[PDB]
């Protein structure tokens, strides 16, 4: 009853697995003389279809044959590049599952995603090799080391080109290869890092089965892409994560042109949007800051861009709002999800977009708000913890039924761990995280509300609020604040102005720290340590 329930699906669930269903397709689109999957605007190098169907082919036998099967995994190291989606495509065309990791990931953070991971075969880009010769000094499962940016044998590592030849036989060829059939609900596809909530990342494993369901959702043009083929998108989007990973897997599923980048630059962006004909952007929820500002949005020709679309962390309606304007667009076609649920099981549906809100719930997908403490099943409007359950939440937690029991509830109920409401046309809005919540004198403290609040204000370029420790107070909401090129506010007009909106309940007693950028997670997300860090060393 108070169940929101998604819609019927235009693409039903095609059978076959991930691998199955993305070879067939990347089949179609090479045939197809001429088909870009792949565009660097960095060095402005493209790459069709049928050179990477081939490529991903050649490394998915050549795999194969040097004995990998469905009881093995693999790393995937590697920033936005033309390299990083060979060795995933590779990989699940035969049944070995994917750990992608962070090319930004540091040496304990890598570690531990590396013994989560166990990889019998670890691709790496030249930048990221020497973490890993690093970490693989405990690390006795690693056999090979790939280089991917490569094209001949570097440092005694082989290339995905040598490898590759070493193993396919001399006479083989690309069309007649066929892709290993298995249990989609048991075998692995992914596993994905998660933020741990507060501790070292877990495994979070992603079965065959999740992936198709992805894809009926890239092919619905309500709830996804339509299937135009040679649309182009402008990816900005880290990969090894669900919102690049996912989005990217079901644009080949579509015959889409990726264009993607390295590294953030607000000069490149827009001609980037311009030149190659953008149809649909993907940014981050923190690069909204450098838009809203003004600059060059209207110096270039964004005529064709149909649409921005984000996720993966929280955005003020305040905010979102201000740069459709400047995009010139109806608004932000935003989705909520958790690693856990694979990719995005909130999606704002085409031409149904709501401010603050992230959207309806997807097809095979049934969510909830739930009474905090009672658990029952709220109505309309009514703020609670959010549950979501579908065929695209995780199978569990790698040797880790514990946490598995504690997120996911006996009726198949994932807990998101989030306050949330459905409204009249069931828009669905994420109010804040859980824990992200800051106790003052025994009162619940929302970032997103303070954030959100001072984002408004003009002078304020972008802020992070967290929960300075008192003692009496035991914790103070405060904020760390970046402005505009020449401007100022005392931090007392600042919180005068935070008071003036608010309650005395949630007054910035903690006060302004300033800062020249935000402590960003690079996953879109803002990163509470360095800030709650920044804080307690100014006070
Ligand atoms: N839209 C949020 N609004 C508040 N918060 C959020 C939100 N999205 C994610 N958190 C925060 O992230 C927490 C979990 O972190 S997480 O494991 O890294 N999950 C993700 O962020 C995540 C993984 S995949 C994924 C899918 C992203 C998208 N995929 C698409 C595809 C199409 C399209 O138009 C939009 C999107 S958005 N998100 C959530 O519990 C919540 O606090």
């Not at 990989?91 to 953070?109: K, S, T």
């Not at 490149?268 to 923190?286: C, G």
């Not at 010139?328 to 401010?355: C, F, M, V």
């Not at 984002?455 to 604040?481: R, T, W």
């Amino acid at each position: 009853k108070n169940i929101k329930k998604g819609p019927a699906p235009f693409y039903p669930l095609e059978d076959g697995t991930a691998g199955e269903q993305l070879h067939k397709a990347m089949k179609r689109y090479a045939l197809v003389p001429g088909t870009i999957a792949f565009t660097d605007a960095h060095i402005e190098v493209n790459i069709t279809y049928a050179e990477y169907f081939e490529m991903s082919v050649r490394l998915a036998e050549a795999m194969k044959r040097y004995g990998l099967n469905t009881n093995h995994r693999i790393v995937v190291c590697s920033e936005n590049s033309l390299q990083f989606f060979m060795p995933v495509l590779g990989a699940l065309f035969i049944g070995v599952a994917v750990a992608p990791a962070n090319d930004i990931y540091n040496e304990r953070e890598l570690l531990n995603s590396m013994n989560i991971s166990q990889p019998t075969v670890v691709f790496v880009s030249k930048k990221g090799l020497q973490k890993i010769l690093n970490v693989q000094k405990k690390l006795p499962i690693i056999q090979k080391i790939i280089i991917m940016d490569s094209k001949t044998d570097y440092q005694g590592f082989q290339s995905m080109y040598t490898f590759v030849t070493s193993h396919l036989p001399p006479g083989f060829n690309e069309y007649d290869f066929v892709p290993e059939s298995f249990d989609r609900d048991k075998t692995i596809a992914l596993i994905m890092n998660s933020s741990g909530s507060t501790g070292l990342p877990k495994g979070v494993a992603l079965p065959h089965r999740t992936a198709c369901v992805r894809f009926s959702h890239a092919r619905d043009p309500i709830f996804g892409n339509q299937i135009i083929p040679d649309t182009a998108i402008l990816s900005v989007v880290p990969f090894h994560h669900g919102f690049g990973m996912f989005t990217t897997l079901g644009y080949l599923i579509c015959g889409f042109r990726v264009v993607l980048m390295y590294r953030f630059e607000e000069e490149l962006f827009l001609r980037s949007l311009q030149d190659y004909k953008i149809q649909s952007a993907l940014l981050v929820p923190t690069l909204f800051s450098f838009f809203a500002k003004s600059t060059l949005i209207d110096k270039y020709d964004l005529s064709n861009l149909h649409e921005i679309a984000s996720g993966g962390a929280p955005l003020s309606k305040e905010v979102g709002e201000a740069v459709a304007k400047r995009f010139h667009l109806p608004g932000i076609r935003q989705g909520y999800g958790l690693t856990e649920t694979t990719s995005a099981i909130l999606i704002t549906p085409e031409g149904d977009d709501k401010p603050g809100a992230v959207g309806k719930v997807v097809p095979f997908f049934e969510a909830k708000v739930v009474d905090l403490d009672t658990g029952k099943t709220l109505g309309v409007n009514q703020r609670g913890e959010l549950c979501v359950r579908g065929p695209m939440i995780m199978s569990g937690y790698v040797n880790n039924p514990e946490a598995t029991n504690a997120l996911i509830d006996k009726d198949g109920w994932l807990h998101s761990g989030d306050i949330a409401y459905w409204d009249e046309d069931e828009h669905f809005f994420i109010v804040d995280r859980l824990k992200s919540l800051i106790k003052y004198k025994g009162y619940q403290v929302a970032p997103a509300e303070l954030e959100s609040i001072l984002l408004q204000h003009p002078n304020i370029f972008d802020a992070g609020v967290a929960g300075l420790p008192d003692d009496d107070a035991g914790e103070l909401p405060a904020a760390v604040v970046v402005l505009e090129h020449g401007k100022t506010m005392t931090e007392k007009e600042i919180v005068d102005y935070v008071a003036s909106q608010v309650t005395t309940a949630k007054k910035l007693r903690g006060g302004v720290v300033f800062v020249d950028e935000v402590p960003k997670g690079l996953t879109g997300k803002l990163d509470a340590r360095k800030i709650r860090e920044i804080l307690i060393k100014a006070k």
